[PDB]
Design an enzyme around this catalytic site. Structure first.
Site, PDB file in Angstrom:
ATOM      1  N   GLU A   1      50.798 101.303  -8.002  1.00  0.00           N
ATOM      2  CA  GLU A   1      51.783 101.398  -6.928  1.00  0.00           C
ATOM      3  C   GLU A   1      51.234 100.778  -5.654  1.00  0.00           C
ATOM      4  OE1 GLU A   1      54.762 102.189  -7.190  1.00  0.00           O
ATOM      5  OE2 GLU A   1      55.017 103.595  -8.828  1.00  0.00           O
TER       6      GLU A   1
ATOM      7  N   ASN B   1      62.851  98.136  -1.041  1.00  0.00           N
ATOM      8  CA  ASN B   1      63.598  98.138  -2.287  1.00  0.00           C
ATOM      9  C   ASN B   1      64.879  97.324  -2.083  1.00  0.00           C
ATOM     10  OD1 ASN B   1      62.651 101.599  -2.419  1.00  0.00           O
ATOM     11  ND2 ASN B   1      61.757  99.948  -3.625  1.00  0.00           N
TER      12      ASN B   1
ATOM     13  N   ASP C   1      67.908  98.302  -2.423  1.00  0.00           N
ATOM     14  CA  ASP C   1      68.961  99.055  -1.771  1.00  0.00           C
ATOM     15  C   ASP C   1      68.754  99.254  -0.278  1.00  0.00           C
ATOM     16  OD1 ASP C   1      66.999 101.040  -1.730  1.00  0.00           O
ATOM     17  OD2 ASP C   1      68.078 102.483  -2.956  1.00  0.00           O
TER      18      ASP C   1
ATOM     19  N   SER D   1      66.126 100.854   1.052  1.00  0.00           N
ATOM     20  CA  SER D   1      65.129 101.898   1.281  1.00  0.00           C
ATOM     21  C   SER D   1      63.749 101.244   1.172  1.00  0.00           C
ATOM     22  CB  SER D   1      65.269 103.046   0.272  1.00  0.00           C
ATOM     23  OG  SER D   1      64.973 102.570  -1.019  1.00  0.00           O
TER      24      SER D   1
ATOM     25  N   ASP E   1      59.388 101.976   0.171  1.00  0.00           N
ATOM     26  CA  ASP E   1      58.419 102.850  -0.499  1.00  0.00           C
ATOM     27  C   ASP E   1      57.121 102.858   0.307  1.00  0.00           C
ATOM     28  OD1 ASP E   1      60.124 103.081  -2.707  1.00  0.00           O
ATOM     29  OD2 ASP E   1      59.476 101.045  -3.311  1.00  0.00           O
TER      30      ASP E   1
ATOM     31  N   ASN F   1      59.626 106.928  -1.781  1.00  0.00           N
ATOM     32  CA  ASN F   1      60.772 106.244  -1.176  1.00  0.00           C
ATOM     33  C   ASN F   1      61.554 107.020  -0.134  1.00  0.00           C
ATOM     34  OD1 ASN F   1      63.997 105.662  -2.041  1.00  0.00           O
ATOM     35  ND2 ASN F   1      62.671 103.859  -1.757  1.00  0.00           N
TER      36      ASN F   1
END
Ligand SMILES: [Cl-]
Ligand SMILES: [Cl-]
EC number: 3.2.1.17
Length: 129
Positions: free
Chosen positions: A35, A46, A48, A50, A52, A59
């Site tokens: 990650e 992301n 959409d 959002s 992380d 998120n």
């Protein structure tokens, strides 16, 4: 902060993530490697809108507030910037909430695709725990 592999394993263990919800410590180290490469400052947008944040790429659509993800929850009740600290407490506490939500570590797509089903214990091999 860019943690060393065993350094992150010991920090996670001290914070009670080892075996949390049945996930042995190598699972968490493996997820953190893919990650964030063990970098607490990692951030990724992301599709959409959002973002992380941190070692476990938590998120903003559900778990933290970053002030720019319209229609969001903040289920860990923290600013997303707290997930970027050199101190991993906030990331660990929030990861405990995420993994307890029903889908276990499948919430982390990188854990499912790169760690699940592999010899995850290899991630803590040689560590003085
Ligand atoms: Cl393990
Ligand atoms: Cl589970």
């Amino acid at each position: 902060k860019v943690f060393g592999r065993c350094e992150l394993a010991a920090a996670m263990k001290r914070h009670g993530l080892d075996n949390y919800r049945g996930y042995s410590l190598g699972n968490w180290v493996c997820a953190a490697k893919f990650e964030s490469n063990f970098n607490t400052q990692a951030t990724n947008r992301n599709t959409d809108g959002s973002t992380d944040y941190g070692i476990l790429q938590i998120n903003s659509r559900w778990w933290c507030n970053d002030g720019r993800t319209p229609g969001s929850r903040n289920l860990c009740n923290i600013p997303c910037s707290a997930l970027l600290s050199s101190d991993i407490t906030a990331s660990v506490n929030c990861a405990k909430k995420i993994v307890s939500d029903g889908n276990g570590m499948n919430a982390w797509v990188a854990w499912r695709n790169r760690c699940k089903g592999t010899d995850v214990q290899a991630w803590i091999r040689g560590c003085r725990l």
